[PDB]
Amino acid sequence: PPPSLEDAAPSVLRLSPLLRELQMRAPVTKIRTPAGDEGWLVTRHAELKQLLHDERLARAHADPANAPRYVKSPLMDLLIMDDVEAARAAHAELRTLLTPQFSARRVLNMMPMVEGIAEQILNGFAAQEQPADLRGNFSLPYSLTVLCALIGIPLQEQGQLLAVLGEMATLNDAESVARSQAKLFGLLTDLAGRKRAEPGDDVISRLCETVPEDERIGPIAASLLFAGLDSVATHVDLGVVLFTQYPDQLKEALADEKLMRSGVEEILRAAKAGGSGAALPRYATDDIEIADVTIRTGDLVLLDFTLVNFDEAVFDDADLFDIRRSPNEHLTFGHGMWHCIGAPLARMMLKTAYTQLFTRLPGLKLASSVEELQVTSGQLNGGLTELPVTW
Numbered sequence: 154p155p156p157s158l159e160d161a162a163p164s165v166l167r168l169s170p171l172l173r174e175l176q177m178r179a180p181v182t183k184i185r186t187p188a189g190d191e192g193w194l195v196t197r198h199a200e201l202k203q204l205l206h207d208e209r210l211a212r213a214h215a216d217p218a219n220a221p222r223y224v225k226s227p228l229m230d231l232l233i234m235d236d237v238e239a240a241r242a243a244h245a246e247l248r249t250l251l252t253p254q255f256s257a258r259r260v261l262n263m264m265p266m267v268e269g270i271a272e273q274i275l276n277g278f279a280a281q282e283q284p285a286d287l288r289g290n291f292s293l294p295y296s297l298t299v300l301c302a303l304i305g306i307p308l309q310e311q312g313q314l315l316a317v318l319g320e321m322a323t324l325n326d327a328e329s330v331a332r333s334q335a336k337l338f339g340l341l342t343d344l345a346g347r348k349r350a351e352p353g354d355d356v357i358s359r360l361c362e363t364v365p366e367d368e369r370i371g372p373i374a375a376s377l378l379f380a381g382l383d384s385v386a387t388h389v390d391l392g393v394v395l396f397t398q399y400p401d402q403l404k405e406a407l408a409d410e411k412l413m414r415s416g417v418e419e420i421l422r423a424a425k426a427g428g429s430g431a432a433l434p435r436y437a438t439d440d441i442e443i444a445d446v447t448i449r450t451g452d453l454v455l456l457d458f459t460l461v462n463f464d465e466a467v468f469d470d471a472d473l474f475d476i477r478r479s480p481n482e483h484l485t486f487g488h489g490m491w492h493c494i495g496a497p498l499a500r501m502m503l504k505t506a507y508t509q510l511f512t513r514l515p516g517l518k519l520a521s522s523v524e525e526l527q528v529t530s531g532q533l534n535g536g537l538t539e540l541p542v543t544w
């Protein structure tokens with residue numbers, strides 16, 4: 154029986170020993186998923202990068218109901234279709250719709266909105282009673298408010314979102330996920346009809362121009378919001394932890410915009426809970442020969458973007474936080490057909506956050522120890538349960 158991927162990591166910002174062992178054993182290796190099934194874990198940079206460009210991996214399985222699962226989640230099950238050409242076309246359309254929204258030009262047009270929301274939230278955060286949770290008081294409201302503004306979700310309708318998005322991340326209750334997913338899909342399909350009638354400068358309105366069916370705009374906007382919210386918030390949090398542990402690198406990043414940009418890359422490479430970094434399931438649509446192994450049609454393949462970021466064949470002293478790594482060859486956003494569509498926004502949001510946070514609160518420090526930080530578990534893209542800081 155293959156080793157089981159565990160529920161989190163023993164502590165934050167260090168790769169879990171089980172993952173480091175799996176990586177040493179083989180480039181592609183059989184594991185047991187949290188959901189109990191068997192799967193291929195890709196553990197090394199060169200092999201992951203090659204498989205990110207292999208057309209034989211798809212979000213498709215001949216029998217999705219019986220396909221080997223990564224996690225027990227009705228969210229993943231919406232992702233997997235039973236025809237390959239139908240899955241390929243659905244994926245292709247998602248990227249065609251969304252890639253223009255995140256061009257360098259359009260992201261540049263988001264900067265004032267992002268900086269302005271960060272300043273309003275930071276104004277309130279600096280006044281909180283200390284120690285204060287940076288995640289609930291800053292990084293989550295920051296991420297939620299920017300993403301809702303860009304997508305076009307009214308301030309008047311945001312109250313219920315943090316509850317529904319958090320529930321959708323649960324691996325603990327299958328029926329609570331599915332009805333939260335429908336609440337969110339229903340909220341945003343309803344919203345799409347309203348913005349069709351009254352368009353604004355936002356993503357939902359621009360999708361209306363090209364997509365005439367509300368019932369398919371809503372799930373795209375919902376999955377856009379779910380894709381960005383926690384990941385951006387968690388990287389604000391862990392980026393803040395790293396910078397409080399290497400204050401000399403924080404100060405030089407504040408002093409030179411080149412080093413703040415490469416500092417954000419080094420946070421994207423290393424600011425990790427240390428647990429399993431695979432995000433979505435992929436299935437072989439044909440047999441693939443690689444790394445002295447044979448992946449078979451229907452097999453589950455897990456691309457662990459976090460784990461390959463610590464591959465010593467690529468990164469000198471990989472456990473070390475060093476913002477001067479350049480070029481920084483992390484694969485945190487994927488690559489090729491699968492590459493994160495929000496990467497330019499995420500990069501800009503993180504740079505905005507660290508700059509404003511540490512300029513306004515230069516004495517920002519952990520209330521307790523890094524070892525005392527509690528990584529969340531039993532969840533999709535959980536990060537920390539809270540991050541108490543003082544300043």
Ligand SMILES: C[C@@H]1[C@H](O)[C@@H](C)/C=C/C=C/C=C/C=C/C=C/C=C/C=C/[C@H](O[C@@H]2O[C@H](C)[C@@H](O)[C@H](N)[C@@H]2O)C[C@@H]2O[C@](O)(C[C@@H](O)C[C@@H](O)[C@H](O)CC[C@@H](O)C[C@@H](O)CC(=O)O[C@H]1C)C[C@H](O)[C@H]2C(=O)O
Binds near residue numbers: 429534
């Ligand atoms: C075909 C389909 C239909 O037409 C439509 C009706 C279907 C809609 C279905 C949508 C389903 C969406 C499911 C998303 C699940 C994310 C899980 C994330 C878990 C992440 C993992 O976390 C772990 O999980 C383990 C279990 C725990 O053991 C462990 N303790 C920890 O918790 C790893 C962490 O990952 C990253 O965070 C970033 C992700 O967050 C990025 C993600 O968000 C993507 O961006 C989501 C992209 C997604 O949206 C693509 C869809 O859009 C494509 C799409 O819709 O196709 C349409 C055309 C960053 C962290 O550094 C990772 C780290 O920790 O090292």
Ligand code: HEM
Binds near residue numbers: 458498
């Ligand atoms: C630090 C923040 C983020 C990280 C680490 C991250 C990471 C990732 C990763 C690893 C994938 C590939 C998933 C897979 O195929 O296994 C992905 C895909 C995706 N990301 Fe991000 N992401 C971040 C922020 C965002 C944001 C803010 C948005 C939207 C505003 C977004 C939208 C998407 C979408 C739509 C996909 C699916 C792409 C596809 O199916 O081809 N991401 N992201």
